[PDB]
Amino acid sequence: ARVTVQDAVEKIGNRFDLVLVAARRARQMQVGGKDPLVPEENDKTTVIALREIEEGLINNQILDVRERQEQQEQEAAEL
């Protein structure tokens, strides 16, 4: 997705919802401190989010499920 962002569009559906999803993922990598999935190859967080979306790993419901799991398990392990 360095040059053309054609595949991810079909992979989600809009030129717009792609922007919000990719921005949210790149935020999670920017400050939240999570680790990426696809290898870096010396590339910024934004293109990394786009590659993850294109390959088929970070959808929307996947984000929701994953954050729900981490929240519940850390809260339960707090005690």
Partner: protein, 99 residues
């Protein structure tokens, strides 16, 4: 010519203009139509508040940029409330309802 941060006006709090006094370029309404046709909506929110008029916004934006976090806290372009006071000085009760 090129600018990243400099002077600011007095009555309306947005950057000066022309190379002689180290000002920023102009983003006339034609460019605003161009940027609405595309569908980009965050970009001109950025160009309307935190690079021009929103004071708290611009200081905190510079803080975040130099700090490594790329985000944005917007407010209200304060030349708008300049307009509010110019209208309600005529004897017209312009004033904006609350939530």
């Amino acid at each position: 010519h090129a600018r990243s941060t400099g002077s600011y006006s007095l009555v309306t709090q947005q950057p000066l203009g022309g190379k002689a006094q180290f000002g920023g370029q102009r983003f006339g309404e034609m460019e605003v139509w161009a940027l609405e046709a595309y569908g980009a909506a965050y970009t001109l929110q950025e160009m309307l508040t935190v690079k021009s008029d929103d004071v708290n916004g611009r200081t905190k934006m510079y803080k975040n940029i130099v700090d490594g976090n790329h985000q944005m806290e917007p407010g209200m372009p304060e030349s708008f409330n300049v307009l509010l006071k110019e209208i309600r000085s005529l004897g017209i009760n312009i004033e904006l309802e609350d939530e």
